[PDB]
């Protein structure tokens, strides 16, 4: 009598895949002041459960919510397979995984000495991945000189921006990059990254599966969780 899930589903191994996917957005002053910041999250569930279960999801200050039609500390018969359990958005007490610290210095009207420092700010137990930093260059840029201790950088002069790429970097660390911009006689610094944790601080408390028509209880379900945070707009002024 449920239009989103058939009857007579049986899995040998009743498994549960729970992906928490957040996008952290941040607009910072060069001086570290959070000008605007928020997280947009969804909770995707892959569900391999037998029959017609009644499940309860439960997990900090959420602002919006947008559940699936099945939802009613929320109970629901989840469909079979992948579906998005809920969307959400938070704005307070967000973990900002990186601190971008620009520093520019003029040299006459010919040179531009630029130095940019990124600070990771999370358990050093954990690695950030796919780290990319864009430093835009002015339009009247003749050439660019740049060196950097970690990772690689290149002056994508078509895009009129420096792109610095870093494979990994653990938390509570710091790396920098220095550049000389010769020019011909101020958008922000962007970052992208992936972190193995929900920046909002969200963590999943319990997921309970109740099947009273079939021969399994909650002790029987195998339950798995994954947290992944990525950047959206992640810019620093200067």
């Amino acid at each position: 009598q449920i239009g989103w899930r058939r009857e007579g589903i049986k899995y040998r191994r009743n498994e549960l895949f729970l992906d928490v996917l957040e996008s952290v957005n941040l607009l910072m002053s060069p001086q570290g002041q959070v000008l605007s910041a928020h997280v947009s999250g969804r909770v995707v569930m892959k569900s391999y459960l037998s029959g017609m279960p009644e499940c309860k999801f439960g997990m900090i200050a959420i602002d919006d919510c947008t559940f699936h039609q099945c939802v009613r500390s929320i109970s629901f018969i989840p469909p079979d397979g992948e579906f998005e359990l809920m969307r959400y958005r938070t704005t307070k007490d967000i973990i900002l995984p990186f601190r971008v610290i620009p520093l520019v210095r003029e040299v006459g009207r010919t040179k531009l000495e630029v130095k940019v420092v990124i600070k990771s700010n999370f358990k050093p137990s954990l690695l950030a991945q796919k780290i990319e930093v864009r430093i835009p260059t002015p339009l009247n840029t003749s050439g660019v000189q740049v060196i950097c201790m970690k990772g690689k950088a290149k002056y994508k002069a078509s895009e009129n921006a420096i792109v610095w790429k870093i494979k990994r970097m653990a938390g509570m660390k710091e790396s920098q990059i220095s550049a000389e911009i010769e020019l011909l006689p101020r958008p922000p610094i962007s970052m992208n990254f992936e972190v193995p944790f929900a920046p909002s601080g969200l963590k999943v408390r319990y997921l309970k599966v109740f099947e009273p028509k079939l021969n399994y209880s909650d002790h029987d379900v195998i339950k798995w969780v994954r947290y992944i945070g990525r950047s959206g707009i992640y810019e620093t002024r200067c």
């Binding site: 999943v204 339950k223 798995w224 969780v225």
Partner: peptide, 7 residues
């Protein structure tokens, strides 16, 4: 890649 257990 990595799913961790929930408990």
């Amino acid at each position: 890649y990595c799913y961790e257990q929930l408990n």
